[PDB]
Design a protein around this nucleic acid. Sequence first.
RNA 1: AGACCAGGC
Lengths: 1456, 107, 287, 43, 49, 57
Amino acid sequence: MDISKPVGSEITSVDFGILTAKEIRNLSAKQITNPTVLDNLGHPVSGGLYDLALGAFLRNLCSTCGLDEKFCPGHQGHIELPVPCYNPLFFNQLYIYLRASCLFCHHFRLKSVEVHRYACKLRLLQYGLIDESYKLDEITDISSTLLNELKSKRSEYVDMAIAKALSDGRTTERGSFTATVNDERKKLVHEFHKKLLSRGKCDNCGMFSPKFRKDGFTKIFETALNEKQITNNRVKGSTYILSTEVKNILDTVFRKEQCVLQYVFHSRPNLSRKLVKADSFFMDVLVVPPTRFRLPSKLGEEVHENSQNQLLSKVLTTSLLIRDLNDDLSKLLEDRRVIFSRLMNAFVTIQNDVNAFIDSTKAQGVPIPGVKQALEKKEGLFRKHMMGKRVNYAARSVISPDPNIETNEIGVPPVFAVKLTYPEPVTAYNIAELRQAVINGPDKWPGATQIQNEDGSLVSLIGMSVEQRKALANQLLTPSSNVSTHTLNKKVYRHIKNRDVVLMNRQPTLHKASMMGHKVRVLPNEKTLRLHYANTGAYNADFDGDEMNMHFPQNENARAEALNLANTDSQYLTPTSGSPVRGLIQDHISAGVWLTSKDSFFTREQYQQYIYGCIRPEDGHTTRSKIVTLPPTIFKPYPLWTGKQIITTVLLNVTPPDMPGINLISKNKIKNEYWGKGSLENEVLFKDGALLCGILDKSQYGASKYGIVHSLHEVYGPEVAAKVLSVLGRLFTNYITATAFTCGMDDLRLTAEGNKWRTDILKTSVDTGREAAAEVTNLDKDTPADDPELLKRLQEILRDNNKSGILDAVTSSKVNAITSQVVSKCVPDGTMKKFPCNSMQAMALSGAKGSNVNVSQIMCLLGQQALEGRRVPVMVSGKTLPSFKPYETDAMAGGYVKGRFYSGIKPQEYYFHCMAGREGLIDTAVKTSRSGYLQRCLTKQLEGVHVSYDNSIRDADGTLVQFMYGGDAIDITKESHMTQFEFCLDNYYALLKKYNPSALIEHLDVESALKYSKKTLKYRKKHSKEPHYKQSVKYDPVLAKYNPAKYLGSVSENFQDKLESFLDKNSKGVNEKKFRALMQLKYMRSLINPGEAVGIIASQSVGEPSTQMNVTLGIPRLREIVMTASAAIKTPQMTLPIWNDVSDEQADTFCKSISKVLLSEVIDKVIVTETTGARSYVIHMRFFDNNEYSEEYDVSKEELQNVISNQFIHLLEAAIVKEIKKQKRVEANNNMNKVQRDRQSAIISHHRFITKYNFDDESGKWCEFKLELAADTEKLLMVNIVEEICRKSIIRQIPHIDRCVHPEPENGKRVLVTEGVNFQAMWDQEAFIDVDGITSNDVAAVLKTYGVEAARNTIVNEINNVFSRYAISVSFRHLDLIADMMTRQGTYLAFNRQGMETSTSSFMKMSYETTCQFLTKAVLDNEREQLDSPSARIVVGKLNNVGTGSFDVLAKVPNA
Amino acid sequence: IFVYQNNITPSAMKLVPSIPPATIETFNEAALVVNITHHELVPKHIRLSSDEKRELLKRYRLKESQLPRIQRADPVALYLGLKRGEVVKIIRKSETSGRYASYRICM
Amino acid sequence: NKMSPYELVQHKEESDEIGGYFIVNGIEKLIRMLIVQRRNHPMAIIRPSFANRGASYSHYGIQIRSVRPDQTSQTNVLHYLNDGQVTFRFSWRKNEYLVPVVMILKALCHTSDREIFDGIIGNDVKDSFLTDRLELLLRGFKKRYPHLQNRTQVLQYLGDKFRVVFQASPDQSDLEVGQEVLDRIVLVHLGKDGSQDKFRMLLFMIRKLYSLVAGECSPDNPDATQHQEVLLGGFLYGMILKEKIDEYLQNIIAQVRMDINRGMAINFKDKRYMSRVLMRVNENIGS
Amino acid sequence: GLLNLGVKDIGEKVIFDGKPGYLGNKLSVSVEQVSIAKPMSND
Amino acid sequence: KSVVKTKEKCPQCGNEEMNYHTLQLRSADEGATVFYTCTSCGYKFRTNN
Amino acid sequence: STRGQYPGLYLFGGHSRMLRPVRYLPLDKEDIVGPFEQVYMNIAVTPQEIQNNVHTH
RNA sequence: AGACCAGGC
Ligand SMILES: Nc1nc2c(ncn2[C@@H]2O[C@H](COP(=O)(O)CP(=O)(O)OP(=O)(O)O)[C@@H](O)[C@H]2O)c(=O)[nH]1
Ligand SMILES: [Mg+2]
Ligand SMILES: [Zn+2]
Ligand SMILES: [Zn+2]
Ligand SMILES: [Zn+2]
């Protein structure tokens, strides 16, 4: 792009139409006719694919415009297909209208009044009349006179409703097409096409039409009429058919029904009034592309012709064979049949070639790719060359770390400073320094490589000497001799200076702080980028070979955005949680522990050396033009300073004067007990900018909230906190290079007493693996390891996967409590060298690098080597390893390793630790690819949602997502210290300067929002003891009535109820009302700006923490909620609130009445007995004792009889008849009483082949019943039948609920969780369950029974606790927008291609996936789009409507 | 409105739209055992007047079809008895803001 | 081959130069080792993909990988159907084929039908799991194939169905093209003169497959290296060299097939015609 | 060697004539020995 | 219902802890051969009975 | 064993096996074993961890 | 411009 070459015209919209055959005979340059590409001697033959009329080809002028290779744009040509053929993009819709239509009267086969019912409902949906289309349907074998009276009043209602809505300011004559009327139109056309295809007779004239058949593509068949209903076509007084006849039918059907199909094929009102034709679905002319776009590839001599020339030649080869097959018919049975059977085969092969040119997967005969498959996937065209592109003016190199860089700069090599260049137009203020740059040349920094003249010409400085180059330096600021180019000036493409801007970038760009705008500083020596350590955690960049990108922006609109907007100093706080990402990392955190210690004393030469080593006033870090110091801590015998007093005057020089010092009371990671007795070094204390107590740590400087750098970011500003990270980064580097820091082998030793403490605890682990084994096996205690009953059941545990899980969770629970006894005892109390000298402990406690579990495995013991939940896997033989005997009950034999990294682990301990190490390297591989497609589905839907100037976030096409961002419209990166009222009171006079209350009253309304905020605060304290359904509120909050960005005091209700809760309690020359007047000004400035790409931020705040990762959990849970929106949820639950009246004994006998009881769960064994020669069976099902299952399942003896009577056998009788069908290809007497003989007689009567039945009526132990069959039948198994029926028969079941568990009470409340969702059946149990507190897990079932807003509340909590399990804090403003976007239609829509079909932006849907399915649906609808979405403004090259491009810039010119 | 025990004959479901302008609503006797607006996860739904519908489409300059949508057949619109094309004010509790009025229209 | 490290320096190579690799176009290629199923061991296998062979297929099954003495392999997977019968599965070309095993139990040797029973049932006749599943196996052969009573009649049916796919000759009878089925497919590590041993090993494999469906056996893990074997790469270089001379011996018949369908000047006893037609085929196997 | 055992495993392959019951002449063609040579050039 | 159911004195140098391993070689008719292996000297011998 | 691997005595002597040397404790010499063979025997990693009557190698 | 192979973070 050239800023000195404007453009006045802009694309406003696009619209997808069908390119007709009449246009592309006028459009065409020259029709091409023979299937030879280029002839001998390297020329292109005239009339072929490579032609000079189609463009300049290979050093030869064009025959249409007469231009060469560099200037010919390429021209459209065509071929003449001799027969109309099928367009494969429209064949699925051509086969709908080829079916469903009468072949005799040439209407559809519906009645003409119901086809008219859709003709005028779709007309109301072209305009913005989504509600008038349903009033139209409320208008009501039958004579055809009142049907004309019915079609009249329906047509007059539309012409009155369109006239009223267009007059009452609602709908343009171009119609209104929002998103929710695209829903009602797609729902109405799909209903119309489904009802067309299901018709027996034509309801206009009642006789049949032969049904068409499509087996695959390239062909259509019609079937012969049946031998029965040919009578209907005699009382009205298989075959391959031609594509000219299919067109001949639909050239009549679309004319007899023109008044209906105009609205099916138009989303908006047809102002052109063009006819819709059957020639749309056919293509009588192929268009060949311009020959520029099909140039051949070249690798030395290996020159191959393009794939499209291979596919367009085969169409031309068939297009001449089909004309040579017309030679004999032009001359004219045996002379006629062989010439016609070979002509019909040419019809199929010219179709199979026009399919294979357009779509390669519709071909047959690894295939040559068509024109559909240059667009579809990654490596397509929308995703490889439109949404992502290769760029100019951009470098990539390995990064090396660098101090002495001011935390917003990048260090560029000399060889990047030479190549990358910037167009500076010469002016009156450039010809001092831009004359010096052009003298220096292409190879002298700072220099220049080119000059662009006024004419668009461009003079390179590479092959020029310095005498030729100084003459061009006197050519720059000259008046132009051309009047036509008199306002243009020369551009000097100078090198990159130290004042330019640079956009750095490390892959994967998981969030927006992984692509920041840095300043530049060139460096003299080597070929690598130089990145400061505060940026290393934002890009997730380490220095073991990372390389990262460097994009150099090319105009002033982009330099002003990566210095002010995409700046690296503006990205201190991330918008995911509001937590900082920037800070010092490893050596600087270990140095502030030593510097801010009580031992650090500095003399006068040392104290003043560390200040000028970090401040350096000439580079502009001080604010006083003279370095001020403090009086020393000690005056006698000789003056000494302190490391507290280092950072006091470090912070005194970088702060702005006439603004008071910082006031902070915070804490740090190191406890008081590491510094001795009576230590106060845990709390830090800043009082008027002076560090008076406390070590400085990771919690103060470093990516951590509410430290000193986070507090300097709030009170003073982001330019100060980015400067403090520079000055402290140099204060600690210069302290380290004079006072260093080492970890050695000395730091890893325990004492001789601590090693004795270690081994005495580990001697109790020799019996731990046996006690845990004896507990699970249900032996009591003290059984030996070689007990044959212990070894028998351990073999039974191994063969089951669930029994082995409760053995690997009891031993792991016991051996991790032996690990927790050594770490509690041996560190820090048993270590030889101690804190602060123990550098292994000193950098683990301080958060520099390491953990407490890392120094555990080094110094104490390495622990249980846990696999994926379980312990180390066991072989088939019961051996965990060849070293250990089978089934031994040792903790060491199952993965608990006692050796430490200091003294070594054994070879069997080494092999267990390698199983756990490979587990981590696979989860680092396989679980960073599943979260990458989570964020892509999220960002495509949420690319266009943004804050409007109404403070009301909404999509790019205009549909409204929320009325206010988060309900309060405050930015996450500005609301950290918003409710830190104790911090803002201590820093009142310094925060009053940055908000400046007196100068900000004139553009405000201070008076009005405060009054209505008291009308509601007084109302809600008076009311709001009742619950929410009773509250007729009578007053909205001040956010819903007043603009919070203009009206002072228009705050949220939690901000008002927490300020009036803070300021009520404590009473502290600032009074009570000047503090509440400054928080409401702090609130209003912390509003979110209009234009914020919120949904990108909301989708990066979910996709980037997802990489950190008896119910489903994690990234499989986010796929169920967000990506698929599954109503077939994997493990649904339902939480039931127990009343306070029912106790724990009345609640767990209650959950035995909901949880299902199978018949399989009550049977001990089933003994069948088959005697044949009538096939007999004696089904004897033996139960447990009645005292055993009436306690366990609460199943009575008589209820178990009714399941066998009415439920078990009716499933068993079916399974025997089902198999006979599919194979055709001690106890009591018999004179017991009158009722059991008739209980038996009712079982025999109502069933098919039972001859005897008896239940154990006196004890409930057995049930025996004879079951005869015929002698004709062969053998059934009749045990695998009975077992499969016994597992499907239910004793007692509440439907869709399979289990009901009473867990421990989590967080006070009493909880009853089920394993299935049935809200209707849990409403009957009012006496046990709070029915008005039943929350759940199935988001699709809370939408069906409790509604839309309850499912919106359900989806927030379920996407919350998938992040709350990993202790990941993502704020409720990103979770709010993903909720309100998924339920924006009153349904539960997914972030996939099925849930985005209801959307206006066609290029957004085409860019995501299934490109030529959304392409066909756009061109069938004749869909015009306003180019609103960010995916649609990159395809056509527009500025976005988000952020900077969300407004226009106008220039006030003084003269009229 | 019309409350029934078990089911309605499909020849008798043709009669509930058979009269304009007076509408007929239809409820189970088992779906009315618990009122769902008393549940904790639902907000206070309030339908707006024709004047309050004009003042919402004027402050935000919305079309009628650009609001968030509520279905006509979810059990909260069936509770309030919503005819198509009218806005429901939804008083929503949140974690950091508290009360704020959202809106949905029933298409 | 037997050069000293002195003589390997005099021939420019390297002193302790280990070989192992192929020099192809100046680039040192080598064929990797592949870990694969053990030879000649029927292991009980549970796979959810065994159910997708059609309807009534269980997830159970057994699988042997038999290697020939020229180190070329052939798998013979037995499936268990939920109907009660079992199924022999193999693959001669890149498509699969399904045979009931009683067709193979009666084609290997001259059997009774109690000797099919006595080879699975030992002295455990009272085990009524096995007796009921072996009722359905032997009566399903009599139901579906009411013919095929002796060995010489089963073997002609098996040769009639695998004649065009095994590329048989018009000279071979159906009795001896059925033995051409049994020698290249079923349990090929016994070869010719081992049909007694192929019989006893099938009666072993059915009982182990019935011991797997009874729960009496754990399924053998194919991913543990207990049941794994190494393709050395040098043997796979010999496996592919069998095929390229199997294909070479077919191109010299596919060339005289092209001579039958076109020409007349054909004399099979003419050395002048042998060298005439053997130069028309692609003999460059080494490329 | 294993290649001679692979030569033997392929066996003989035949093809008959169309020249005139009997089918014609058998042509029972095979390979019976394979041997690799150490690499030799001709200069 | 399943779980509710409920020295050698080696003559070479003198050592009592001596590594042994019984192994029945040929049939169950003969006695198990006890293969002895020392660690203090390393002398090995076996024992029929 | 109860529901373990199908029992039997399997001898292997063919090509392409996997083989490692191990020291056999009665009559101390070298023994060569395979992966199918190793899963049911008790080797020890050092001769100071031999337990009596359980370790063969 | 694809295939396969070897890597980088
Ligand atoms: N998107 C991907 N990022 C990767 C991949 N490999 C490495 N990385 C990035 O490079 C960084 C490498 O970290 P590692 O995989 O080595 C985890 P490690 O335990 O070695 O961290 P340290 O011990 O702190 O070095 C990591 O932050 C990743 O963001 C990859 O395959 N894909
Ligand atoms: Mg790295
Ligand atoms: Zn041209
Ligand atoms: Zn008709
Ligand atoms: Zn001894």
